[PDB]
Amino acid sequence: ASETFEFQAEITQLMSLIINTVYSNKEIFLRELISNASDALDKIRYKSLSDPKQLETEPDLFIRITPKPEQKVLEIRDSGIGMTKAELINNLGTIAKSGTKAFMEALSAGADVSMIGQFGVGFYSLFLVADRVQVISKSNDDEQYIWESNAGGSFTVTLDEVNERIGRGTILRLFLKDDQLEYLEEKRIKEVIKRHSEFVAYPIQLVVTKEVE
Amino acid sequence: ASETFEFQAEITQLMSLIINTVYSNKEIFLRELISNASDALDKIRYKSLSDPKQLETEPDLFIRITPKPEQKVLEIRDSGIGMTKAELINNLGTIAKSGTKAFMEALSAGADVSMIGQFGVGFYSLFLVADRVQVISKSNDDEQYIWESNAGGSFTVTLDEVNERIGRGTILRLFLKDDQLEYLEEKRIKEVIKRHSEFVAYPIQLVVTKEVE
Ligand SMILES: COC1=C2C[C@@H](C)C[C@H](OC)[C@H](O)[C@H](C)/C=C(\C)[C@@H](OC(N)=O)[C@@H](OC)/C=C\C=C(/C)C(=O)NC(=C(c3ccccc3)C1=O)C2=O
Ligand SMILES: COC1=C2C[C@@H](C)C[C@H](OC)[C@H](O)[C@H](C)/C=C(\C)[C@@H](OC(N)=O)[C@@H](OC)/C=C\C=C(/C)C(=O)NC(=C(c3ccccc3)C1=O)C2=O
Ligand code: NI
Ligand code: NI
Ligand code: NI
Ligand code: NI
Ligand code: NI
């Protein structure tokens, strides 16, 4: 039960410009995804001030980062507001984003890639380190869906019958490039968070697998 | 798409006798589940000697233990052979087990609960620490299914559309009793494994969540 959608043309250009013209300061992808997780968490918390029951699907407010080294995947999960199917479709690629063209012109003129979050398109920085991404999301107002893109001209949206149930929120599942596997490392992850994601109102958890011996 | 099955009557008696008459040496449940995981791993590995492609669904052979403290759940996962739907139904409760009545008589006479694995029913030791269990399993020869029981007279078997895809093998998902939450602790888990599960041919991984600060 799987639909395909074409990306708005500037978004496709944006993604190409990120994958192919940007060389450094890649670690900023993690600040941007932590900022997005934090924005989603702010929104469910604010929503719950006048509708406490919204929190019941998942009472704990957190960000959690799960390196999956054998799969070469990094997951960034939040228990924020989540996105409905129509929200994944409208906001993750089909509709013109304010910022998209403006950001690409600032980049052309010499702007540091890190300014991407200030243009409201910092989601697409994930393509600095990942050649495939799934956004698995569960809004209180919809079923769990999977949005997926390999940075081509199109993305798919699919009713989620394959992943763990999230009570509420989003998993960013990044299929890292072979040159960017340092973001599977516990120490590298902690460093980038401590240096660049210093003021976050929510706990940030790191899931570590160790061998018992 | 969810079927209910009655437990064979001695199995129901066994489970009651475990929950209600046994007081100590509870930690043996972990040795038994590690032994079962190890038996499942031996079987896929042996199967693959003459059918290498069996391993392709999940090339890594491991046991992994994931404490889920906010859910009061402990999961024990293996990438062994897994069980088909008909295997969950036949082997986990509907058919008479050799050992069941014999074990219950040995227990009555004073046998230590730890002898349960020697009677071939050591699976049911999980009821020392858990009041609910899901066995989520994926055999190469079937779809993923969920078997579930709260130790009543019946269990359910359900096509799995809610949990993460396992490539191949089994997750024991234990809903721990409130008095047995020590088995959520990293140090307690390591101790019981080091003391009682010393000779295991497969890596045993422990998944730990820490806050980054
Ligand atoms: C306004 O809002 C925004 C946006 C638009 C939209 C998309 C939003 C959305 O809707 C549905 C929502 O609200 C959400 C909450 C989302 C978010 C942030 C997220 O996530 C999560 N984790 O959940 C995301 O990711 C997936 C999506 C998108 C993003 C983007 C595109 C960007 O980059 N930015 C932004 C953003 C940002 C910027 C900066 C920082 C952060 C974020 C924002 O805020 C926006 O857009
Ligand atoms: C013969 O075989 C057995 C049994 C019977 C059956 C059930 C088996 C089965 O079938 C399907 C299979 O083969 C598998 C491999 C399984 C197993 C072990 C497992 O797991 C896993 N992890 O996977 C289990 O759990 C879920 C199941 C069951 C168990 C039981 C009941 C017991 O206790 N024991 C045994 C057992 C044991 C004993 C001792 C130690 C370990 C195990 C065994 O071995 C048996 O039975
Ligand atoms: Ni690098
Ligand atoms: Ni830095
Ligand atoms: Ni279906
Ligand atoms: Ni105790
Ligand atoms: Ni002991």
Curated annotation (Swiss-Prot), chains A, B:
Protein induction: Expressed constitutively and induced by high temperatures dependent on transcription factor HSF1. According to PubMed:2674684, it is constitutively expressed at low levels, however, due to the specificity of the antibody, this result is unsure.
Bridged cysteine pairs (disulfide): none
Record's subcellular location: Cytoplasm
Effect of mutating residue 80 to S: Reduces client protein activation activity, leading to growth defect at high temperatures
Source species, domain of life: Eukaryota
Result when mutating residue 106 to N: Induces a 6-fold increase in ATPase activity
Family named by the database record: Belongs to the heat shock protein 90 family.
Other observations noted: Present with 444943 molecules/cell in log phase SD medium.
Domain comment in the entry: The TPR repeat-binding motif mediates interaction with TPR repeat-containing proteins like the co-chaperones AHA1, CDC37, CNS1, CPR6, CPR7, HCH1, SBA1, SSE1 and STI1. CNS1, CPR6, CPR7 and STI1.
Complexes and interactors: Homodimer. Interacts with the co-chaperones AHA1, CDC37, CNS1, CPR6, CPR7, HCH1, SBA1, SSE1 and STI1. CNS1, CPR6, CPR7 and STI1. Interacts directly with the substrates GCN2, HAP1 and STE11.
Protein name (database record): ATP-dependent molecular chaperone HSP82
Organism listed in the record: Saccharomyces cerevisiae (strain ATCC 204508 / S288c) (Baker's yeast)
